[PDB]
Symmetry: C2
Subunit: 107 residues, 2 copies
């Protein structure tokens, strides 16, 4: 009746990436956490949801923004959050690595 | 006689990327500079030289390192160099965007 599809679905798709991504930064420096499986869902959803690199960039900005408010409460040193840039670059670099592997030389 | 091929060639290939990349950060915030043509050579060489994202990351580190010594002499505020992270993420994000376009749905 009120069929509300719209790009919102993709948004929800991003929301998950947000939580999933969050798990990466959370388990990125983990010891035995299966981030790969985590990164896979991210790399897969991004590739699955025909997502653009810019999208992840924003989720990063938003995430980095979120963690910013966190560190403040953690009375730590955004230094950790200041190093997350590597993760962001690593995340996109990861899914991108998958793009390359999906190239069957069209020649 | 002394045929010295070795991966050095790829290194030279990187050296160029270094200068080309350098032009990006130089013309990135340009006004009418044809960075696209510049970014194209980079995105093309990287894709051409079957280069990995990590490689560009290092060239970035090295470059960001180089510019670091520069700013010091420029008596400015590494702030500019501190914003180059966007370029690095943009550079790889650019070539990666090309990877995606090179995907003829294998399905």
């Amino acid at each position: 009746a009120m069929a509300r599809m719209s790009p919102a679905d993709k948004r929800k798709l991003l929301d998950e990436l947000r939580s999933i991504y969050r798990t990466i930064v959370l388990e990125y420096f983990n010891t035995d956490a299966k981030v790969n499986e985590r990164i896979d869902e991210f790399v897969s959803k991004a590739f699955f949801a025909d997502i653009s690199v810019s999208q992840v960039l924003e989720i990063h900005v938003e995430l980095m923004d979120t963690f910013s408010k966190q560190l403040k409460l953690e009375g730590r040193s955004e230094d950790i959050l200041l190093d997350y840039r590597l993760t962001l670059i690593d995340v996109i670099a990861h899914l991108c690595e998958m793009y390359r592997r999906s190239i069957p030389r069209e020649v």
